[PDB]
Amino acid sequence: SMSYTWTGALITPCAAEESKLPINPLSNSLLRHHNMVYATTSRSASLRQKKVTFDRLQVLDDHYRDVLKEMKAKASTVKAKLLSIEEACKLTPPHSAKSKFGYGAKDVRNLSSRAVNHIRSVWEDLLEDTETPIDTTIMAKSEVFCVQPRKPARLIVFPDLGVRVCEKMALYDVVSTLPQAVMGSSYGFQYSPKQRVEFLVNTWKSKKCPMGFSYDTRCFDSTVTESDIRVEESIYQCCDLAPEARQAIRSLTERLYIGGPLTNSKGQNCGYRRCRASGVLTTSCGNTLTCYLKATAACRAAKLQDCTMLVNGDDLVVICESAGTQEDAAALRAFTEAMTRYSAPPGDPPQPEYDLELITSCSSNVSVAHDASGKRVYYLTRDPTTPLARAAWETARHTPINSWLGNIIMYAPTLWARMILMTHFFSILLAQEQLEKALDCQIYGACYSIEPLDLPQIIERLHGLSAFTLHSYSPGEINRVASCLRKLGVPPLRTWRHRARSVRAKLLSQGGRAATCGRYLFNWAVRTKLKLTPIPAASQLDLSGWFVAGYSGGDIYHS
Ligand SMILES: CCC[C@]1(CC(=O)O)OCCc2c1[nH]c1c(Cl)ccc(Cl)c21
Ligand code: NA
């Protein structure tokens, strides 16, 4: 069937949309080529619609069915509990889209009578009505990028707040535990960046003659079929479930997950969806299981030997045994045709790689540096173009989500996050005296409230003390960073070092946690290095639940 059917009504914005980076002294000191930074808007929605609208092709075979059964057998060991209204309400982000039924996120979190009563009625409706399609709103997503040598806005589809709370009650436990039970070590969201690197490195080292490749599915969500979504439900149904949870899952699958009507911000009917909605609780878990299922079966069909998968939603990386250059190229081509038959066609044809560092997965690649002892240490990095473009935007315009904070946390060991992001934002936090102000950021889709002053402890816990002592980065990494700065008009690294010396001094002069930031985060900025010992409060932080599962689009807030 067609991924989407459109009426002609436009995908509309619910307010003015900013698309250009402002000329601001704060952002200008970080990035001068402001005209190269832009944010997507509803104005490009039609271009996106054209690309994601097509008739799907899908042919399942014995390999697919064999793998599905293997996955279901593992799912059969799971027991999901069903969340209480209170637990579900608490998982709701303070700024989550309000309901069109008289209440907002603040009301849900406060357990107001109106919110609770409506949520209970939505729940009962899921139990009684097993067929009526549930309404969803479609909007153009606002994301910042650097112009290319532009991308149209992505389309986000989500149901009302009441429904979102019910999804949590019926499926939060399932999507938080089933993926790992089913895919084991291949489930990417169970790893912190350091653990992801460890898995990739050990997997690569375990092969007699390693070959790897990332597989980019062309607009994955639109390739997900009704069959795929019911197969996904068949996996969830293997869990021991409370009766109402089982019915809720069955109803949500038929009324929301497999498709439904699309309404714009103006309340007009835009069309119908018959593929994955980006904004529902099961999107991350569902995409991961679907991608893992198709890829695992495709490897068998393609005759790729000993394939180890690492899946994060629609992002896939595969490491296997090489059978020779020509043989690998042919097998990969076969893999792709198998994926295509499973309705997982390629965006960019995959390419075999024989250098782990040359593989980009989850927009990242493994690279190497050295710790204080001079010992080699692998870490996760990525092209800094987007992170920098967004940091500039977030500097000139106050945004709900602070991607720069999430990037500092996830890429703390990198050359660019240390010399640029840390230096830039801590200097601004010092000037505005807001070091104590907690900010929101996202990690694997979930929203987290974090205090900048806790960064040292957070980083130590996630990356280890070596994150504060890495030096002698690779030639390729340095070159990539440096060329990126020239392209964006970002001052050269030498300038950032100079700026950091002053930031570090100011931090030390304030003592307390501020001084600890100066000592650990900016030890790279002083000639005579300080001996960095474990931070006491670091072994007391509760990072439980930080790297357990993915929730992109799941409307999840962690406290
Ligand atoms: C995180 C900074 C690391 C390190 C040391 C290193 O990489 O050996 O710390 C001192 C300043 C500095 C470093 N790397 C740099 C590079 Cl590639 C370019 C320019 C400068 Cl000015 C630096
Ligand atoms: Na893709």
Quick one: tokens of 399?
């945004």
Q: How far is residue 540 from each of residues 457, 512, 544, measured CA to CA in Å?
A: 9, 17, 11
- Classify residue 153 by burial, with Cβ atoms within 10 Å: 0-12, 13-18, 19+: buried
Report how far residue 444's alpha carbon sits from residue 455's, in angstroms, rounded to the nearest whole number.
18
Q: Do residue 343 and residue 201 come from a single domain?
A: yes
Quick one: tokens of 321?
């045994």
Instruction: Residue 454: name the closest of 414, 501, 400, 514 by CA.
Output: 514
Radius of gyration over alpha carbons of the chain, in Å? Answer: 24
Strands 4-6 and 269-273 come out as antiparallel
Report how far residue 379's alpha carbon sits from residue 45's, in angstroms, rounded to the nearest whole number.
37
Regarding the beta carbon of 471 and ligand 1, being less than 6 Å apart is answered yes
Quick one: tokens of 314?
């629609």
All residues at 6 or more sequence positions from 104 whose CB lies less than 8 Å from its CB, including other chains = 96, 98, 161
Q: Are 499 and 398 in contact (CB under 8 A)?
A: no
Quick one: tokens of 207?
């092969």
Q: How far is the CA of 46 from the centre of ligand 2 (A)?
A: 19
Method: X-ray
CA 94 to chain CA mean position, Å: 20
Q: Do residue 335 and residue 455 come from a single domain?
A: no
Regarding the beta carbon of 419 and ligand 1, being less than 6 Å apart is answered yes
Q: Do residue 357 and residue 395 come from a single domain?
A: no
Tell me if residue 349 falls in helix, strand or coil.
coil
Quick one: tokens of 257?
């997950």
Q: Is 315 annotated as a binding residue?
A: yes
Residue where one domain finishes, among candidates 297, 329, 361: 361
DSSP at 133: P
**End-to-end CA, the chain:** 41
β-partners of residue 318 are 213, 309
Regarding the beta carbon of 370 and ligand 1, being less than 6 Å apart is answered no
Which helix (H) or strand (E) segment holds residue 377: the answer is strand 376-381
Q: Are 297 and 342 in contact (CB under 8 A)?
A: yes
- Classify residue 143 by burial, with Cβ atoms within 10 Å: 0-12, 13-18, 19+: middle
Pocket test for ligand 1, best of 524, 526, 527, 529 (most atoms within 8 A of CB): 524
Q: Do residue 208 and residue 173 come from a single domain?
A: yes
Report how far residue 176's alpha carbon sits from residue 189's, in angstroms, rounded to the nearest whole number.
10
Residues around the ion ligand 2 (C-beta < 5 A): 216-217
Tell me if residue 343 falls in helix, strand or coil.
coil
Regarding the beta carbon of 363 and ligand 1, being less than 6 Å apart is answered no
Domain count, the chain: 2
Instruction: Residue 507: name the closest of 496, 498, 516 by CA.
Output: 516
Report how far residue 1's alpha carbon sits from residue 283's, in angstroms, rounded to the nearest whole number.
20
Q: How far is residue 352 from each of residues 210, 295, 504, measured CA to CA in Å?
A: 10, 15, 44
Pocket test for ligand 1, best of 419, 486, 504 (most atoms within 8 A of CB): 419
Among the bound ligands, name the one nearest to the CA of residue 480: 1
Report how far residue 375's alpha carbon sits from residue 357's, in angstroms, rounded to the nearest whole number.
18
Q: Is 314 annotated as a binding residue?
A: yes
Among the bound ligands, name the one nearest to the CA of residue 362: 2
Report how far residue 216's alpha carbon sits from residue 235's, in angstroms, rounded to the nearest whole number.
24
DSSP H helices in 443-548:
455-463, 475-488, 493-510, 512-521
Contacts by 76-79 with C-beta closer than 8 Å and gap 24+?
76/238, 76/239, 77/181, 78/174, 78/177, 78/178, 78/181, 78/238, 78/239, 78/240, 79/239, 79/240
Atom in ligand 1 nearest the alpha carbon of residue 525:
10
Quick one: tokens of 168?
């949590």
Q: Do residue 485 and residue 495 come from a single domain?
A: yes
Q: Do residue 18 and residue 138 come from a single domain?
A: yes
Q: Do residue 248 and residue 106 come from a single domain?
A: yes
| Residue 217 amino acid letter | T
Report how far residue 434's alpha carbon sits from residue 426's, in angstroms, rounded to the nearest whole number.
9
All residues at 6 or more sequence positions from 151 whose CB lies less than 8 Å from its CB, including other chains = 40, 44, 145
Range of the domain at 378: 362-559
Residue for token pair 């990332």: 214
Instruction: Residue 158: name the closest of 261, 249, 19 by CA.
Output: 261
DSSP at 541: -
DSSP at 524: G
Q: How far is the CA of 317 from the centre of ligand 1 (A)?
A: 31
Q: Are 119 and 187 in contact (CB under 8 A)?
A: no
Q: Do residue 356 and residue 403 come from a single domain?
A: no
Regarding the beta carbon of 351 and ligand 1, being less than 6 Å apart is answered no
Which helix (H) or strand (E) segment holds residue 33: the answer is none
For atom 18 of ligand 1, which residue has the closest CA?
493
Q: How far is the CA of 468 from the centre of ligand 1 (A)?
A: 12
DSSP H helices in 493-538:
493-510, 512-521
Helices 243-252 and 226-236 pack at an angle, to 10 degrees, of 170
CA 12 to chain CA mean position, Å: 25
Instruction: Residue 134: name the closest of 287, 272, 282 by CA.
Output: 272
Among the bound ligands, name the one nearest to the CA of residue 315: 2
Residue where one domain finishes, among candidates 305, 327, 361: 361
Regarding the beta carbon of 478 and ligand 1, being less than 6 Å apart is answered yes
Report how far residue 346's alpha carbon sits from residue 283's, in angstroms, rounded to the nearest whole number.
20
Report how far residue 520's alpha carbon sits from residue 530's, in angstroms, rounded to the nearest whole number.
9
Q: Are 556 and 503 in contact (CB under 8 A)?
A: no
Regarding the beta carbon of 473 and ligand 1, being less than 6 Å apart is answered yes
Tell me if residue 221 falls in helix, strand or coil.
helix
Residue where one domain finishes, among candidates 311, 342, 361: 361
Q: Do residue 326 and residue 460 come from a single domain?
A: no
Q: Are 492 and 482 in contact (CB under 8 A)?
A: yes
Q: Do residue 510 and residue 403 come from a single domain?
A: yes
Regarding the beta carbon of 299 and ligand 1, being less than 6 Å apart is answered no
Residue for token pair 């992001």: 421
Residue for token pair 């990035």: 31
Q: Do residue 135 and residue 223 come from a single domain?
A: yes
Regarding the beta carbon of 411 and ligand 1, being less than 6 Å apart is answered no
Q: Are 13 and 141 in contact (CB under 8 A)?
A: no
Strands 136-140 and 260-263 come out as parallel
Atom in ligand 1 nearest the alpha carbon of residue 415:
1
All residues at 6 or more sequence positions from 224 whose CB lies less than 8 Å from its CB, including other chains = 275, 276, 286, 287, 290, 343
Quick one: tokens of 498?
């100079």
Q: Are 92 and 166 in contact (CB under 8 A)?
A: no
Quick one: tokens of 462?
């996630």
- Backbone φ/ψ region at 159: left (φ over 0), alpha (ψ -120 to 50), beta: beta
For atom 15 of ligand 1, which residue has the closest CA?
493
| Residue 517 amino acid letter | C
Among the bound ligands, name the one nearest to the CA of residue 314: 2
Length of the chain: 559
Atom in ligand 1 nearest the alpha carbon of residue 494:
21
Which helix (H) or strand (E) segment holds residue 298: the answer is helix 283-302
Strands 136-140 and 269-273 come out as unpaired
Q: Do residue 349 and residue 379 come from a single domain?
A: no
